[PDB]
């Protein structure tokens, strides 16, 4: 029936693009996961290094009393 194959059309087009919008999110999100994935590249960097500077700080201070 035309009322079926037709309703199907407007429904499928309202099914694919319904994924479009969703697809757009995976686009932006993915672009953000990598974007914010940069800060972590610095976090890991800073953290360990911050421990290096502090470690040298706790050492000198201890030897400054001995």
């Amino acid at each position: 029936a035309l009322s079926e194959i037709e309703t199907r059309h407007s429904e499928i087009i309202k099914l694919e693009n319904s994924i479009r919008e969703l697809h757009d999110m995976f686009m932006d999100m993915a672009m953000l996961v990598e974007s914010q994935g940069e800060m972590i590249d610095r976090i890991e960097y800073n953290v360990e290094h911050a421990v290096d500077y502090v470690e040298r700080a706790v050492s000198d201070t201890k030897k400054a009393v001995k």
């Binding site: 099914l15 319904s18 919008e21 953000l32 914010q36 976090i43 040298r56």
Partner: protein, 61 residues
């Protein structure tokens, strides 16, 4: 026709999820940002302290 409307809401079901996921990336934006800057200014005040400590070393060692 059933399998059609059947797949519909199912897809939208994932769309509703991405929504929450998007709200999750925003949280990961506030944290990283401010924190990365704070922890970054840490090495600044930490390095200086290591410097002054060097003086305490050449006068107390």
């Amino acid at each position: 026709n059933r399998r059609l409307q059947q797949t519909q809401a199912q897809v939208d079901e994932v769309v509703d999820i991405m929504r929450v996921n998007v709200d999750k990336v925003l949280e990961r934006d506030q944290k990283l940002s401010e924190l990365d800057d704070r922890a970054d200014a840490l090495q600044a005040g930490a390095s200086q302290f290591e410097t002054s400590a060097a003086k305490l070393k050449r006068k107390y060692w």
